[PDB]
Structure 1
């Protein structure tokens, strides 16, 4: 399979869905979702995983919040903004 953070970084480094996700500072590993178009990106993540239900941003964020312990993805005080770690970027 493929992990959730690896899936978001690939979209960023392929320029796929520029309307749903984008860098805020490639150096700081900061990225942000689109308020009005994030669900389109959420739908893809669910289909690509073959999940039983339709993936939503709420369920995707619930999984992103787990990365706070390990450290692959940390939340930022900005709206819909997150940040990769220096390790994953490498």
Structure 2
């Protein structure tokens, strides 16, 4: 099954949900979710995974928090809804 970080990177590459997620500084790998439209993207993640319950942005962000220890995705300090993929994730 697709991993969360790959789902998000794929969305950014395809542009399919541009009103829910966007690059802030693509060369640095920083991206941000829409305050008003992030739930639609979270719903899509849960449906793609076949999860039992409806996915919420809060639960998806709880999964993102686990990537901070490994560095796969870091949450940008002093910003809201903003994250940064590692260089390794971006190298494909």
Give the TM bin, normalised by the shorter chain: over 0.9
Gaps of 5+ in 2: none
How many Å apart are 1:8 and its aligned residue? 0.1
**Cα drift, residue 86 of structure 1:** 0.6
Compute the displacement of 1:38 (Å).
Answer: 0.1
Post-superposition Cα deviations, 1:8-27, rounded to whole Å, max 9, x if no partner, equal 00000001100000000110
User: Following TM superposition, where does structure 1 have runs of at least 4 consecutive aligned residues deviating by more than 3 angstroms?
Assistant: none
In 1, Cα distance between the equivalents of 2:78 and 2:90?
21
RMSD: 0.8
The number of residues matched between the two structures is: 90
1:75 deviates by 3.7
Sort the Cα spacing of 1:18 and 1:60 in 2 relative to 1 into closer, same or farther, 3 A.
same
CA distance in 1, matches of 2:71, 2:46: 23
- 1:77, CA displacement in angstroms? 2.5
Match status 1:83 vs 2:74: no
Preserved CA contact (<8 Å) 1:29 1:83 = yes
- In the alignment, the residues of structure 2 paired with residue 28 and residue 54 of structure 1 have an alpha-carbon distance, to the nearest angstrom, of 32
* Residues 20 and 40 in structure 1, CA contact (< 8 A), matched pair in contact too: yes
Query: Structure 1: which 5+ residue stretches go unaligned?
Result: none
What is the deviation of 1:76?
Answer: 3.6
Deviations along 1:10-52, one digit per CA (max 9) or x if unpaired, are 0000011000000001101000000000000000000000000
Q: Normalized per residue, which structure has more helix?
A: 2
Normalised TM-score (structure 1): 0.97
